[PDB]
Design a protein around this ligand. Structure first.
Ligand code: HEM
Ligand code: HEM
Ligand code: HEM
Ligand code: HEM
Ligand SMILES: [Ca+2]
Ligand SMILES: [Ca+2]
Lengths: 324, 313
């Protein structure tokens, strides 16, 4: 009644009003500035075509609008790019894998991408060949006799990503005290999200982002007889038999990071809900129910970051050229 | 020193302090905001992978750092992406072709690109499927019942491009009065650029971008100017504003060093000979043509809907 406001408040938290602190990697204006430049600089790739913004697009929800894509070395094959927004809050860094692999695997999205699209010696040569980047790395990494390294390049970038957060969605304003930040169908959909137990895998600060479960969405085999992207076509499979797992993704800003699941197979938010009303979980959902949940998930879209586009410095005669 | 300064004030003009008016397509905040969203919006392309910023990248001197790409349907083969910066002040719209051919070639950078990577039916359908874009087109183009048109999409983008201009280069501050805006080597470069006659093809407000000439840079100190008048074939003499930041050079992106492009240009075909030092002086001068990069806020672009077409596979 507002047991509901108080329950939601227990199970969830709003996005804070400050970039969180990164262990080993302190924030500063200069570092945020460097990290912004590199995030958009396609010179990190060997071709000089691909930046992190290519797939992780700040004006499109932090994603890329594609079913799948291949950006990071650890990827099992093509996978739907998750959003960069609020990524700083997640702890499940990987879409999917054997549960034993996933526990000892090294973290580092920047290093996995660039060692895929280039080699670090060629990236560091790029950065050292440009007097402005060198100056920036000195201000951002004050103690180091040589601050221009592949791992510092990843640290700058990550201090930038940690500014890419989306506070003050309608739902966080509801968490913060204001019942009327949610409308009545949003409020009803919150109620089902909770009672139907979505909150179990999709809960917390980020509404997911934090656990692996032995369940994946699959395209069911026989028939050509239903619209492309209809729920009829997709189901949850149980993957415990093979000690295999998937992350239960953060649901923040889900309404703007379509298409959905690890394979990008469902375009409709109502439908991605209907698929999740799965028996594998003991969850049953009526049309009406899946529609109110998706309404509640609409309330998850926060303030999108105002990102002034970095003016990146000119290559010099010493700068590697696009790889043939 | 006073003679040089007046001579330059004579032959060139600074970038204006503000977006020039485009006949039949007036600026407004909303039209500018709309044209920005669409210039960054990869849903103009059928694959939803390419936007204008992809190759005319606003933080990278308005080009794409590649030798060649294919963005417009008039291109017969891959060509170096010219900067979008100060593009508004140019009149020579195409890189190269038979002079007769180009005379009849339909213009419109926006139309020719979106027609290559998609069709107008599919783009219009995409814009019509997002309430937020329909709402914006009606505010920007109130004089029309259905303002969501291929022609108006191009207009919005162009009024945005008209803002992507680069005032206050060291050269421009020299033209407005301050002699010391230019250093000693830069000043010596200017005298040479004038005296050797670069300014014939690269003069006025944008230092080129206005004429076609029967000279092209081809494989021959590897590359050289070639006379193409016998084929009735022409190339644009590109605007040199921001040339230092828009490598590689020429139509085919064959030359990466700005000192080497100046040396290729010091060609017998025009009657110019340049020494090693002379090319270096002038290169220093071209260095003073880089202006203030525009401060652009990344647009926040509106989500597709169930009616929006999917990526073309
Ligand atoms: C160095 C630039 C990049 C950065 C900073 C970056 C950032 C990230 C981050 C932070 C994650 C994890 C999200 C989370 O943990 O919640 C991730 C995963 C992913 N990113 Fe990127 N990315 C970059 C380049 C790219 C590119 C260029 C592409 C596309 C061609 C791409 C596609 C992907 C995909 C498909 C995943 C999911 C991989 C998987 O777990 O299967 N990334 N990226
Ligand atoms: C009815 C309640 C639920 C709703 C509305 C819901 C919602 C969603 C949505 C919208 C997605 C796709 C997100 C994206 O692609 O960014 C998703 C994926 C997923 N969720 Fe749920 N969820 C519910 C219950 C659960 C439960 C109970 C579990 C775990 C036991 C779970 C685990 C997962 C997993 C593993 C994925 C990724 C599957 C894949 O990508 O192949 N969800 N969920
Ligand atoms: C609709 C988005 C785009 C806009 C507004 C745009 C803008 C322009 C403009 C204004 C010009 C001529 C500049 C002048 O005449 O001074 C130009 C030429 C050119 N652009 Fe684009 N561009 C767009 C998309 C792209 C894309 C996606 C690519 C690359 C894949 C591209 C590559 C090129 C190339 C190669 C030329 C030289 C064409 C030639 O004359 O041979 N453009 N562009
Ligand atoms: C020493 C005097 C000159 C200098 C410093 C010079 C400088 C330049 C530069 C730096 C470029 C490359 C611009 C770019 O890629 O964005 C260029 C190209 C070009 N310039 Fe000049 N220029 C000079 C003389 C001339 C003259 C006298 C003409 C015409 C009669 C001319 C016409 C052209 C043409 C047609 C191109 C494009 C050719 C191609 O891309 O293949 N230039 N020039
Ligand atoms: Ca997605
Ligand atoms: Ca160029």
């Amino acid at each position: 009644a507002d047991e509901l406001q108080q329950r939601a408040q227990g199970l969830f938290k709003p996005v804070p009003a400050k970039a969180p602190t990164l262990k080993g990697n302190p924030a500063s204006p200069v570092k945020v500035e460097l990290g912004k430049m590199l995030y958009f600089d396609p010179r990190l790739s060997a071709s000089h075509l691909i930046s992190c913004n290519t797939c992780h697009n700040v004006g499109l929800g932090g994603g890329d609008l594609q079913a799948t894509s291949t950006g990071h070395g650890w990827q099992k094959g093509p996978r739907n790019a998750p959003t960069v927004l609020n990524s700083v809050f997640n702890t499940a860094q990987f879409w999917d894998g054997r549960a034993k692999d996933l526990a000892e695997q090294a973290k580092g999205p920047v290093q996995a991408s660039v060692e895929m699209n280039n080699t670090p010696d060629q990236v560091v040569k790029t950065l050292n060949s440009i007097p402005d980047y060198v100056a920036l790395f000195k201000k951002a990494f004050p103690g180091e006799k040589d601050p221009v390294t592949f791992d510092n390049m990843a640290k700058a970038i990550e201090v930038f990503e940690a500014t890419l957060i989306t506070p003050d969605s309608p739902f966080d304003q509801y968490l913060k005290g204001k019942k009327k930040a949610l409308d009545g169908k949003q409020t009803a959909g919150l109620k089902l999200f909770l009672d139907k137990g979505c909150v179990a895998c999709h809960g917390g600060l980020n509404l997911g982002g934090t656990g692996y479960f032995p369940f994946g969405v699959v395209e069911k085999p026989a028939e050509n007889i239903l619209p492309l992207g209809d729920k009829g076509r997709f189901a949850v499979t149980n993957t415990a038999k093979d000690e295999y797992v998937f992350r239960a993704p953060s649901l923040r800003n889900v309404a703007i990071t379509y298409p959905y699941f690890h394979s990008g197979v469902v375009w409709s938010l109502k439908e991605a809900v209907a698929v999740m009303g799965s028996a594998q979980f003991g969850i049953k959902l009526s049309d009406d129910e899946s529609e109110a949940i998706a309404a509640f998930l609409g309330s998850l879209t926060g303030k999108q970051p105002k990102v002034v586009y970095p003016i990146m410095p000119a290559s010099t005669d010493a700068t590697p050229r696009p790889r043939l």
